[PDB]
Amino acid sequence: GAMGDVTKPTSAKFIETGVKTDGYIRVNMPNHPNEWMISSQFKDSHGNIGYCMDSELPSPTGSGAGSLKYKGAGSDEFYRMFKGGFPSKTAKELGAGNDTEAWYATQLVSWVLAGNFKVSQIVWSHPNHTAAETARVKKAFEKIYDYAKNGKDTPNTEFSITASKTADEGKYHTFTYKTASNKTGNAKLTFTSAKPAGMKIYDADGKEITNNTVKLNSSFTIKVPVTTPSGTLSFKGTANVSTTNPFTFDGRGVYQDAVVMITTSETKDSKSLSAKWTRA
């Protein structure tokens, strides 16, 4: 199995949406019983929601903050928090009564995943919100958290090239292969042995490829002249795909660190394939 190389972002800029809350819960912190966990909703400059990693630092927004430099790649738990939390899932789907509750429930998951406090420290009540409000938040939290901790989905890029059929056609030995991926993009073929003279590559529509590039979720055909001495050819593909993964950014000990889904590129190899032919 191959390992994909995800291109890392270098920085991110965050903007307040205007949504804020004093929180629907409190936390027994080590020196501070029933400490409030207030928050401001923010987005990165491409309009994707950011979540706070540090409960005791201010939001990473305004002229002071500026851009936050890249810190690291978010775990599968953080990936799932985004996929199974707000706004990827609606308030109704999460059991939250409105979008503020759904968002805060997700931020609560973020704080716990980042290690700010344990679930046993959460006080499920707040003086400015009713028990029913807090309980919807609790229900949403538990759904999202359970999925983040125990769900199976990851940002993994699947990529394969698989031989489907072979045939002699006209003046060529032909070898057809199927490409497959769960991400959009294309693949580049690299030949790992000598290429026979007069070798050609064709796309699924029968049109010649001359830039060694193939489509994903498609097919292509390699053609080797029947005049070629008996032997073998080996190759692989390297997919170049678009992928949306969670990344963390550095608040520099002044603003909170923040995690956000960013669309970037990834390269990933297929397995090694061989075409074999015998000269008539």
Author numbering: 1 to 34, 35A, 36 to 184, 185A, 186 to 280
The authors write:
The B. anthracis BaTIE and the 86 kDa E. faecium EfmTIE86 proteins are predicted to comprise a Class II TED as well as three and five CnaB‐type isopeptide domains (IPDs), respectively. EfmTIE86 was identified in genomes of vancomycin‐resistant Enterococcus faecium clinical isolates. SaTIE‐TED (Gln254‐Gly502) and EfmTIE86‐TED (Asp39‐Ala314) were determined by ESI‐MS to be 17 Da lighter than predicted (suggesting the presence of a thioester bond), and readily yielded high‐quality crystals. SaTIE‐TED and EfmTIE86‐TED crystal structures were determined using Se‐SAD phasing and standard refinement procedures. Continuous electron density between Cys and Gln side‐chains either previously shown or predicted to form thioesters (SaTIE‐TED: Cys296 + Gln467,5 EfmTIE86‐TED: Cys88 + Gln292) confirmed the presence of these bonds. Despite pairwise identities of 18–23%, all three Class II TEDs in this study display very similar tertiary structures. With exception of EfmTIE86‐TED Trp146, side‐chains of these residues hydrogen‐bond with the thioester‐forming Cys backbone.
